[PDB]
Design a protein around this ligand. Structure first.
Ligand code: HEM
Ligand code: HEM
Ligand SMILES: c1cn(-c2ccc(Oc3nccc(Oc4ccc5c(c4)OCO5)n3)cc2)cn1
Ligand SMILES: c1cn(-c2ccc(Oc3nccc(Oc4ccc5c(c4)OCO5)n3)cc2)cn1
Lengths: 291, 291
């Protein structure tokens, strides 16, 4: 067998042009190929413009239309995602001009607000700046946007390490079993900063014990045309008393009705794999602290 | 850290009385507190009248005097606004009895006319109806009242998405690089309607290439005493050859003379932050089309 690695690690220098160029061209091809017989001259013009941009700047920038296409195709290319059957139902937030952790925080608040939608969950992805030389990475250190702290264990067991990490960074822990972890945000390669999520932004389902309604993956990397975006949180909705509690509180889960309706909406939008979502190495294992 | 979200999203039901009430009371307090030792009996009477109005109607209405105060304090509370140093220089237009998109259009024409003032720019805000149940929102889909369309890019790059949106809505594009976008106006929660701004209302500075003289933010939400106003466009004036072109054409910018004179005028008027201007989620990402 020759499976590929599902992890894409850090770099300490820009991607070499001889490597980036062919990848960029292959992506531009799959983008314009999605127009069948249309836009041959547009395809060539874009090829020419990207090549000169790479040769002059060392990299290139996607158009927002190309970015939206990439995020949806990477979702389609996700092997284990049940949700990928309706891949066209995705809202993209473009945060590629983001510069600070405080700005990252506001983008994430926007995402949580929109996606939670008072329970009527919507799928969304927020895309922060692509990797340049790999020393200025944007990253979310969280594994999910919303998750409970873990501390005889109290809270979520799978967060024990991250919870201690937040505490080390100055986060003041309560010791409940449903404490929502803070956001730990790294911008432009700097040391992470800690941001409490405003409680009103966290919708929870009461089991009739409780659980948060928004499942959002915070820690993966989007690869597209040789470009890498190491910060790109996305969310879908969840797939017992839980089955009853979510429906009774009007929070979306993937029951048969939702499966049918979301596929129907997808279907109306018609009126090595790449692009791809990669796992990364946990950033606290690779980060060089500056202070 | 525990920063607050700078975005305030949609609702699908009225604000609960147990939430609105304390907010209303706190605002009434800051309003009457602006009178120091004066009007204690007036303060109590207003508290009593607002409470009964909330308990009987589910909401309450600001007096125009309270509204003027709120708009000026929210401006004072705007962290990044250089202009907030002279917050008392603000003309308020009360459009809270507005019902249709056509009426919205006429209010906006009035605003542009008054604020442009043939180049001698005046700061103004126009306040449309507050949010009720959140299904009848007034919104301007534009980010600014005046902005050029973007389409190899032709025009403003940051409007490409909105420009395509107008085109989708039946707007017939020229393909110049200084096409003024139409107003896209939603009234009472209905689908937006498209209105060309009368060309004579748009003052432009010629660079001695050109640019519009009136910078007006169209898309923010004013919060005051628990009430939300999701349509409340405001304008100030602008902060190279541009510096020369504006002064030569007698269009106000914030040069030292204007800084001094506007502060002087402000100074003569003496002879979680709330109220506050929030960002919103772009309405085309949240709107449910009715037809
Ligand atoms: C509409 C809701 C969605 C549902 C019901 C859904 C469901 C799932 C499920 C059940 C898993 C496996 C979880 C596990 O094994 O622990 C998964 C994995 C994943 N999902 Fe989703 N998903 C949805 C939306 C999304 C979106 C919006 C994206 C990205 C734009 C996405 C990308 C992924 C990725 C990258 C993985 C890992 C795939 C792999 O390793 O093969 N999903 N999803
Ligand atoms: C007299 C002219 C004024 C000047 C020179 C001025 C200037 C500015 C500037 C330079 C910014 C930052 C723009 C950016 O970073 O992109 C700003 C932001 C803003 N301005 Fe003004 N402004 C003026 C009048 C007003 C008025 C009339 C209001 C409202 C009544 C206002 C409310 C705001 C708000 C809400 C923001 C964003 C504040 C933030 O995010 O912290 N401004 N203004
Ligand atoms: C969209 C979101 N995901 C996630 C996958 C995995 C996640 O981690 C996680 N932690 C605790 C509990 C769960 O439970 C699920 C199960 C199924 C599912 C989930 C979370 O989100 C999408 O579908 N997941 C969170 C989100 C996958 N696609
Ligand atoms: C009053 C008006 N504003 C605006 C802020 C931002 C706006 O968006 C925008 N778009 C393109 C170019 C600019 O340039 C500026 C720069 C400074 C400034 C501007 C616009 O308006 C007030 O002060 N702004 C428009 C208006 C802020 N206060």
């Amino acid at each position: 067998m020759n499976p590929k690695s599902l992890t894409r690690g850090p770099r300490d220098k820009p991607t070499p042009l001889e490597e980036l160029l062919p990848h960029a061209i292959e992506f531009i091809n799959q983008y314009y190929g999605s127009f069948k017989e249309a836009k041959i001259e547009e395809h060539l013009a874009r090829l020419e413009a990207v090549t000169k941009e790479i040769e002059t700047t060392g990299t290139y920038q996607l158009t927002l239309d190309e970015l939206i296409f990439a995020t949806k195709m990477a979702w389609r290319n996700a092997p284990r995602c049940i949700g990928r059957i309706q891949w066209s139902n995705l809202q993209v937030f473009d945060a590629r001009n983001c510069s600070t952790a405080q700005e990252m925080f506001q983008h994430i608040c926007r995402h949580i607000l929109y996606a939670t939608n008072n329970g009527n969950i919507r799928s969304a992805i927020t895309v922060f700046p692509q990797r340049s030389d790999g020393k200025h990475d944007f990253r979310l250190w969280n594994s999910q946007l919303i998750r409970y702290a873990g501390y005889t264990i109290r809270g979520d067991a799978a967060t024990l390490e991250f919870t201690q990490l937040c505490i080390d960074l100055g986060w003041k822990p309560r010791y409940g079993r449903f404490d929502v972890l803070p956001l730990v945000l790294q911008a432009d390669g700097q040391d992470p900063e800690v941001f409490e999520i405003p409680p009103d932004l966290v919708l929870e389902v009461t089991m009739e014990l409780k659980w948060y309604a928004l499942p959002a993956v915070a820690n993966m990397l989007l690869e597209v045309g040789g470009l890498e975006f190491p910060a790109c949180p996305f969310n879908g909705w969840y797939m017992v008393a839980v089955l009853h509690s979510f429906q009774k509180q009007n929070v979306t889960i993937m029951d048969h009705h939702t499966a049918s309706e979301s596929f129907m909406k997808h279907m109306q939008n018609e009126y090595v794999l790449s692009p791809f979502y990669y796992y990364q190495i946990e950033p606290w294992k690779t980060h060089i602290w500056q202070n």
